[PDB]
Write a protein that binds this ligand. Structure first.
Ligand SMILES: Cc1ccccc1CN(c1ccc(C#N)c(Cl)c1)[C@H]1CCN(S(C)(=O)=O)C1
Length: 243
């Protein structure tokens, strides 16, 4: 068993393929919102089997899923684009793949999201590294006052940091593996800035949804309404690997 047990578990609990259910701006945005609803459901289900997560206070579980909703979607988009289209298209779902031609306005945000699959291609991120990084992304922001289950949270983060180091070790050399840890963790740090612009665009679109004729499903609407205003206002503590 060359592949470490926890990485193998993460492989098995990965979501199955998620379809958007999918051509104008409002219809494209509505289809992306419909995908976002299904992605949110899949993340909550995933979190139920994620080792360590269910042992956190339920308030912290909800908070962490809501905080990391956008980040986990765009990180998953990065993987699928990388895997299916060599990072040269945005593979939101099998029934929703976007190239330049299908971006007209929104295009600017698509270009910034596009930076992630490009870094995956550049770094040649392995599935084992991706799966550990994904868990760290879920645990990458906390409230200003911390979590109720802070001690449990810290231990879990450390466990998946240690697992990421194992993941890197699968493919030699103390200097190189140390350099690769910096690169992958700096990628995660850099996502905070990218997701800020995605959060802002989302909240703006949510506010103007009636005028734009864009439907926002109920579960993802609650995340947007409940959390994005205070996240954008800076009422959370982003965690960073590098100061
Ligand atoms: C913020 C943004 C920008 C471009 C394309 C998509 C998004 C975000 N979305 C999104 C949906 C699914 C996935 C996946 N997988 C991703 Cl990464 C983003 C959804 C959720 C909110 N919007 S919006 C602009 O109407 O508020 C569409």
């Amino acid at each position: 068993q060359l592949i470490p047990p926890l990485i193998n578990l993460l492989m098995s609990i990965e979501p199955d393929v998620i379809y958007a259910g999918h051509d104008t701006s409002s219809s494209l945005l509505t289809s992306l919102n419909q995908l976002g609803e299904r992605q949110l459901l899949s993340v909550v289900k995933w979190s139920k089997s994620l080792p360590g997560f269910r042992n956190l206070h339920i308030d912290d579980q909800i908070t962490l899923i809501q905080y990391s909703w956008m980040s986990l979607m765009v990180f998953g988009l990065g993987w699928r684009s990388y895997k299916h289209v060599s990072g040269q298209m945005l593979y939101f779902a099998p029934d929703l793949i976007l190239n330049e031609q299908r971006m007209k306005e929104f295009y600017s945000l698509c270009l910034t999201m596009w930076q992630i699959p490009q870094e995956f291609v550049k770094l040649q991120v392995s599935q084992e590294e991706f799966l550990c990084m994904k868990v760290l992304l879920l645990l990458n922001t906390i409230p200003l006052e911390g979590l109720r289950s802070q001690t449990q949270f810290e231990e879990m983060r450390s466990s998946y940091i240690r697992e990421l180091i194992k993941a890197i070790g699968l493919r030699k050399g103390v200097v190189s593996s140390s350099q690769r840890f910096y690169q992958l963790t700096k990628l995660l740090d850099n996502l905070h800035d990218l997701v800020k612009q995605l959060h802002l665009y989302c909240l703006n679109t949510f506010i103007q949804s009636r005028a734009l004729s864009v439907e926002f499903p109920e579960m993802m609407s609650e995340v947007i309404a409940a959390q994005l205003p205070k996240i954008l206002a800076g009422m959370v503590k982003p965690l960073l690997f590098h100061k």
